RNA sequence: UUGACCUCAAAUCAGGUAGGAGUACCCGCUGAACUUAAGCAUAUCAAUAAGCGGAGGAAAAGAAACCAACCGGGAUUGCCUUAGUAACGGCGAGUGAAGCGGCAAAAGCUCAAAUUUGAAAUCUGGUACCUUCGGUGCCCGAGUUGUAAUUUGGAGAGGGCAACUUUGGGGCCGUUCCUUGUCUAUGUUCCUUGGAACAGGACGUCAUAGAGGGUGAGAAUCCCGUGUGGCGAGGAGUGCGGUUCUUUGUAAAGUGCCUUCGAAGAGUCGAGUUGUUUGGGAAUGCAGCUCUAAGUGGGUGGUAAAUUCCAUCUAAAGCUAA
RNA sequence: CACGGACCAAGGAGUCUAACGUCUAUGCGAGUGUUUGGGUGUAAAACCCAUACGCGUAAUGAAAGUGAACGUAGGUUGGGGCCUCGCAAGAGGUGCACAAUCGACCGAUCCUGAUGUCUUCGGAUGGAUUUGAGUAAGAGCAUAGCUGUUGGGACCCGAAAG
RNA sequence: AAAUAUGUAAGAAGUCCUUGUUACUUAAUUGAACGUGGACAUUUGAAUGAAGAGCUUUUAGUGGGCCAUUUUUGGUAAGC
RNA sequence: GAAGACAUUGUCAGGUGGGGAGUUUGGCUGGGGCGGCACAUCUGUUAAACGAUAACGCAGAUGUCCUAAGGGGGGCUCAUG
């Protein structure tokens, strides 16, 4: 669509974007990354502090799949109670008929929070969970239960 | 170079890339000779469904510990615990893992169970003239889905003991960490004297 | 070994009705045999020992099982392997030299 | 001395094979520099250009000396994804994947290692004949330094017990396969200009047939075709559909029970240096020099090594349709 | 009195991708992405679905790993809108988004050290001018295009070379 | 110590009165960092003015410079 | 016949090695080679009453030194005539 482009918006006026008096030079800093540890070392000190260099400790054979933390939180949590019932087990929300929940079998290992919810004693069979977070699920009523 | 601050890219296109780039002008072209693959397999095949039967099995690793999905064989144990044998099993149209076995229970049963059934499905003829045709499935996986077998039930009660799940496993999370250092000071109480 | 159902701990992981595994022939690739056995004796008196043999059999009779078995990893490599080496080292020693 | 064995051979020797082309694409190797870094040796370039060797429609890849550290997964491949991340690097420029997930696609298996030991039971070549991609009457040699048969890691043999089960394969013509041979609706009626009708305007017809072209200008309707199936051809062929000839058969094989056994691939493995390649970093593969192992033992377990098991395949031998 | 340009006709110079940053447009909307593949098709169109995985919501640590409510998600000022009263003006209250700001929430770090302790695990509370690419009742996913990108022939032409 | 150039200051985020918190601090709820409510509308506090005051976003091009004024360095002097 | 487990030959380490490769071989700068550093710096000035402010401008310093010449207090008053 080289209509709409300022292309046409400038063609006859010599320099053609770049300049006249300095113009464009193919590779002028240079090509790919311009001298870093150089003169280009102004660039990445204010917009980019922190990139040469190494860090830590190193990890050899570290899969994602071995540090997999799939974390959620109370604001919410209420997302993996399926809606059919979800009603049925918050306003007439009891004991005895408490919500099993399977977060493995759903893809959210760990268990923390946020915002508190409505006080409803559910069962939730987790991985892993926070301190301060088991803390708000017995005093509404929910409960944890390890699997894997 | 640079010009001004932008976003720090590690492109890979510095080659003979441009001599082994394929844009697959050949897509759904290729997804075409799919159907008539098995379209022209079956029309010599005669009433054969083109695919056996793949296992149900849970996925390893930490993420994919929650998922059972369609495995590959059925080992001697449960080709036997089918009423024969793996050479049976094959010459029929049932898969046998030669090098995989049966390590927990719980997918024994479901694939078993699983096993009986695709057994009352295969209609099989004798190789004198005769062989009576029936129809035929151009399927076998999507025939007998395999959508979590057994994960749990909807309804339950609530089970409040006193264990925190929190401190069971930051104590447990000492248990895992002090096993051998907890063990080294086990066989220096082990010979005072 | 069933696990501790938990996440972590002794045992990471869910424990479910495990089975005990059928056989394994795999495991067992090196068995003893009396046909490999009988055989690899007539082997320690038609070759007898060998030059690097005879000379770490008396290398023990000499600074002892340090000299001789700090040799065998150069004139081997593993030191599992270069242990599993002085073993039939000593076996030749009583079982030849003796009665 | 006669028939000989053991070894090198041997002539336009019988009957056969191997040598080039081609290098879009596979496998090897080889082996860059420019450039990049604003210079440049590090590195990049690039495990790439040229050079060189041997095939195919696919090829290498592929049945575990795998992967993981899971309730574990279960030949490798391709793909999205992983992830331009782990990882390498004056840790400067930059370089940079694999398990499994989704998926398409799906295949299995076979040789040495054993006593055939009541009988070389396995075959070349060649020759009268014959129903031939061959064979029988017959004979040598190959060959007992191991051929058949035997079994092989998923296993399996000898002894017995006491039972059951699976069919083997050609003619005949169709279907399945490749090219296909060929018929195949619709009009040439008229007016207006026109060299000429495929034109401005109509007037009919076909429309499972307005693809397209051509024909003396815009042709759906004139020529071929088209769309649509039919009737024949040359062969392929027992996949399928079965019928006729052959019961071939005191033929072999798979599955169940107890015991004993259970052979499982080496100047290789790994280790120690050089250096190449590198994601692979106190070894990622690889070649060389040297060393030179074992049998509940050994390869792997991505920070070196010592140390008890655990996990995990059975290397070093082979083919294999997508 | 620097340079090309005799003169005329047609080729001929900020192009595309791979992944992105800017500004905005639109579907859905804490979802989204159908199109890798599988069903269907007048047939390369279109149309449909999946399990995926991505990104996001979750961050803070070198990693172990830990992982966001004193409080109506809050104290203080200015604020649009609404509201009510008012002849107007405004008095006054309710003050989204947002701007300045005090404590607080979580990680890492520096501290202290109640509990019990397979006797060195474990670590509430009160804390520190510390601290961070966060929380303070999601805004992204997916697409087209516009200025800039950097890997490539990379605005078009040319070096000695190698 | 001139002229000429220069920074700050001219209000509802202010002033006058009350007095509530603090682990601050003070001999001292003393003071102070900080609020509650009470009094005063644009002569609400010199002049004058505004394609509106304010503010984030975002990317090109320029990063060789040269003349005039007075002050002025070098330099004989310079169209240096 | 000679030479003979030393040479030959396979492999490392060691040495030599512009014979061969590849490359740099600072720049600023009254052109530049040269000197100098007007290069990271800094004393007063140049700077024309804030500040900011060129030059190979000008009269110069910088790479160290001190467990006391430093820290803190106490007593004392120095050059000099």
Same mark, same amino acid.
Not at chain 1, 95 to 104: G, M, N, R, Y
Not at chain 2, 102 to 115: K, M, P, S
């Given at each position: 669509?080289?209509?709409?482009?300022?292309?046409?918006?400038?063609?006859?006026?010599?320099?053609?974007?770049?300049?006249?008096?300095?113009?464009?030079?193919?590779?002028?800093?240079?090509?790919?990354?311009?001298?870093?540890?150089?003169?280009?070392?102004?660039?990445?000190?204010?917009?980019?502090?922190?990139?040469?260099?190494?860090?830590?400790?190193?990890?050899?054979?570290?899969?994602?799949?071995?540090?997999?933390?799939?974390?959620?939180?109370?604001?919410?949590?209420?997302?993996?109670?399926?809606?059919? *019932?979800?009603?049925?087990?918050?306003?007439?929300?009891?004991?005895?008929?408490?919500?099993?929940?399977?977060?493995?079998?759903?893809?959210?290992?760990?268990?923390?929070?946020?915002?508190?919810?409505?006080?409803?004693?559910?069962?939730?069979?987790?991985?892993?969970?926070? *301190?301060?977070?088991?803390?708000?699920?017995?005093?509404?009523?929910?409960?944890?239960?390890?699997?894997? | 170079?640079?010009?001004?601050?932008?976003?720090?890219?590690?492109?890979?296109?510095?080659?003979?890339?441009?001599?082994?780039?394929?844009?697959?002008?050949?897509?759904?072209?290729?997804?075409?000779?799919?159907?008539?693959?098995?379209?022209? /397999?079956?029309?010599?095949?005669?009433?054969?469904?083109?695919?056996?039967? $793949?296992?149900?099995?849970?996925?390893?690793?930490?993420?994919?510990?929650?998922?059972? /999905?369609?495995?590959?064989?059925?080992?001697?144990?449960?080709?036997?615990?089918?009423?024969?044998?793996?050479?049976?099993?094959?010459?029929?149209?049932?898969?046998?893992?030669?090098?995989?076995?049966?390590?927990?229970?719980?997918?024994?049963?479901?694939?078993?169970?699983?096993?009986?059934?695709?057994?009352?499905?295969?209609?099989?003829?004798? $190789?004198?003239?005769?062989?009576?045709?029936?129809?035929?499935?151009?399927?076998?996986?999507?025939?007998?889905?395999?959508?979590?077998?057994?994960?749990?039930?909807?309804?339950?009660?609530?089970?409040?003991?006193?264990?925190?799940?929190?401190?069971?496993? $930051?104590?447990?999370?000492?248990?895992?960490?002090?096993?051998?250092?907890?063990?080294?000071?086990?066989?220096?109480?082990?010979?005072?004297? | 070994?069933?696990?501790?159902?938990?996440?972590?701990?002794?045992?990471?992981?869910?424990?479910?009705?495990?089975?005990?595994?059928?056989?394994?022939?795999?495991?067992?690739?090196?068995?003893?045999?009396?046909?490999?056995?009988?055989?690899?004796?007539?082997?320690?008196?038609?070759?007898?020992?060998?030059?690097?043999?005879?000379?770490?059999?008396?290398?023990?009779?000499?600074?002892?099982?340090?000299?001789?078995?700090?040799?065998?990893?150069?004139?081997?490599?593993?030191?599992?392997?270069?242990?599993?080496?002085?073993?039939?080292?000593?076996?030749?020693?009583?079982?030849?030299?003796?009665?």
């Amino acid at each position: 669509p080289s209509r709409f482009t300022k292309t046409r918006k400038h063609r006859g006026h010599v320099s053609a974007g770049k300049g006249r008096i300095g113009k464009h030079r193919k590779h002028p800093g240079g090509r790919g990354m311009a001298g870093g540890q150089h003169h280009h070392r102004i660039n990445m000190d204010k917009y980019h502090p922190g990139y040469f260099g190494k860090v830590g400790m190193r990890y050899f054979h570290k899969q994602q799949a071995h540090f997999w933390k799939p974390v959620l939180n109370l604001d919410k949590l209420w997302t993996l109670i399926p809606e059919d *019932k979800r009603d049925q087990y918050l306003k007439s929300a009891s004991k005895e008929t408490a919500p099993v929940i399977d977060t493995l079998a759903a893809g959210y290992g760990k268990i923390l929070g946020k915002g508190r919810i409505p006080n409803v004693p559910v069962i939730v069979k987790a991985r892993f969970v926070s *301190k301060l977070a088991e803390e708000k699920i017995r005093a509404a009523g929910g409960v944890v239960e390890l699997i894997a | 170079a640079i010009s001004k601050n932008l976003p720090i890219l590690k492109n890979h296109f510095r080659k003979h890339w441009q001599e082994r780039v394929k844009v697959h002008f050949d897509q759904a072209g290729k997804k075409v000779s799919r159907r008539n693959a098995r379209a022209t /397999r079956a029309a010599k095949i005669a009433p054969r469904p083109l695919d056996l039967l $793949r296992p149900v099995v849970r996925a390893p690793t930490v993420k994919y510990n929650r998922k059972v /999905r369609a495995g590959r064989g059925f080992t001697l144990a449960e080709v036997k615990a089918a009423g024969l044998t793996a050479a049976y099993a094959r010459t029929i149209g049932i898969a046998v893992d030669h090098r995989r076995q049966n390590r927990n229970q719980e997918i024994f049963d479901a694939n078993v169970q699983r096993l009986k059934e695709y057994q009352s499905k295969i209609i099989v003829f004798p $190789r004198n003239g005769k062989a009576p045709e029936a129809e035929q499935v151009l399927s076998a996986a999507a025939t007998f889905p395999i959508a979590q077998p057994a994960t749990d039930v909807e309804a339950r009660a609530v089970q409040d003991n006193g264990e925190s799940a929190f401190r069971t496993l $930051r104590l447990a999370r000492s248990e895992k960490k002090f096993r051998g250092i907890r063990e080294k000071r086990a066989r220096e109480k082990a010979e005072a004297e | 070994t069933v696990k501790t159902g938990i996440a972590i701990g002794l045992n990471k992981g869910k424990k479910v009705t495990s089975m005990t595994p059928a056989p394994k022939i795999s495991y067992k690739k090196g068995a003893a045999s009396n046909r490999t056995k009988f055989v690899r004796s007539l082997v320690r008196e038609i070759a007898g020992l060998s030059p690097y043999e005879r000379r770490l059999i008396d290398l023990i009779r000499n600074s002892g099982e340090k000299r001789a078995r700090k040799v065998a990893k150069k004139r081997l490599g593993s030191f599992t392997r270069a242990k599993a080496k002085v073993e039939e080292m000593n076996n030749i020693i009583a079982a030849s030299r003796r009665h």
